[PDB]
A paper describes a structure:
TpbA is a dual specific tyrosine phosphatase (DUSP) that has a conserved tyrosine phosphatase domain, and relevant phosphatase activities with p-nitrophenyl phosphate (pNPP) and phosphotyrosine peptides have been reported. TpbA (PA3885) from P. aeruginosa PA14 has been reported to be secreted to the periplasm and to link the extracellular quorum-sensing signals to EPS (extracellular polysaccharide) production and biofilm formation via negative regulation of c-di-GMP (3',5'-cyclic diguanylic acid), which regulates biological processes including motility and biofilm formation in bacteria. TpbA adopts a canonical eukaryotic-like DUSP fold with additional secondary structure elements that distinguish it from other DUSPs, including an N-terminal β-strand β0 that caps and extends the β-sheet, and a C-terminal helix α6 that packs on the outside of the protein. The active site architecture of the DUSP catalytic domain is defined by four loops: the protein tyrosine phosphatase (PTP) loop containing the conserved catalytic cysteine Cys132; the general acid loop containing a conserved aspartic acid that functions as a catalytic acid/base; a variable insert that varies among DUSPs and is predicted to involve in substrate recognition; and the α4-α5 loop that is equivalent to the Q-loop in protein tyrosine phosphatases (PTPs).
Native TpbA crystallises with two molecules in an asymmetric unit (a.s.u.), although our results and those of Koveal and colleagues show that it exists as a monomer in solution. The two molecules in an a.s.u. are continuously visible in the electron density map from residues 34–195 and have an identical conformation, yielding an r.m.s.d. of 0.1 Å for 161 aligned Cα atoms. In each TpbA monomer, additional electron density is observed adjacent to the PTP loop that is consistent with a phosphate ion that was introduced from the ammonium phosphate monobasic in the crystallization conditions. The phosphate binding is typical of DUSP enzymes, with main chain amide atoms in the active site PTP loop and the guanidine group from Arg138 strongly interacting with the oxygen atoms from the phosphate ion. The ligand-bound and the lowest energy ligand-free TpbA structures can be superimposed with an r.m.s.d. of 2.6 Å for 120 aligned residues, indicating significant conformational changes exist between the two structures. The core DUSP fold is essentially unchanged, but the largest structural changes occur in the PTP, general acid and α4-α5 loops, and at the C-terminal of the protein. The PTP loop, which binds phosphate, undergoes a maximum shift in Gly135 of 5.9 Å to accommodate the phosphate ion. The general acid loop, which is disengaged from the active site in the ligand-free state, becomes positioned close to the PTP loop via a 3.1 Å interaction between the backbone carbonyl of Thr102 and the conserved PTP arginine, Arg138.
Residue numbers in the entry: 34 to 195
């Protein structure tokens, strides 16, 4: 993250980075991450895996939004749905989205958020994804292949027509 527009590191032990005041990006958090999430005022936790976050969140008054998925099966339709839901959650307050390792599934949706929601030019989102310190390229080939393949114009058009 030497580009200032890339996500800013907050807690590397769980691969936690800030994209904005209302959007964070991480790997699987644990019980001792809760205090931090509360200081960040996270109101919603979005998971792209089947693990039940309520197990480590305990009594934290956050909404749990479970969207378990597989990077190698994500399509345009799924992305639009996720981005719409992330956006809606942001309107409620700050959002944490995570997967297992915080770099493949999360890197896919983060990258698509950059492109479709913030209008970044694809190569730029891809560079954040593969070189932002979230992991190495070998960890995220699925995310990479989807992003490389996605029709950004169509996704933007479809996003506007919702």
């Amino acid at each position: 993250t030497r580009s200032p527009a890339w996500a800013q590191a907050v807690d590397p032990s769980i691969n936690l980075y800030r994209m904005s005041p209302t959007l964070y990006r991480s790997a699987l958090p644990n019980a001792q991450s809760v205090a931090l999430l509360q200081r960040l005022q996270v109101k919603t936790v979005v998971s792209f895996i089947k693990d039940d976050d309520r197990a480590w969140l305990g009594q934290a008054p956050v909404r749990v939004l479970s969207l378990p998925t597989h990077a190698d099966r994500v399509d345009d339709a799924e992305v639009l749905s996720v981005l719409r839901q992330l956006q809606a959650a942001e309107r409620e307050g700050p959002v944490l989205m995570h997967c297992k390792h915080g770099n493949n599934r999360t890197g896919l949706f983060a990258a698509m958020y950059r492109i479709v929601v913030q209008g970044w030019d694809k190569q730029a989102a891809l560079e954040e994804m593969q070189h932002g310190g979230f992991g190495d390229e070998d960890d995220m080939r699925d995310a990479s292949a989807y992003v490389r393949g996605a029709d950004v114009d169509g996704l933007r058009l479809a996003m506007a027509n919702g």
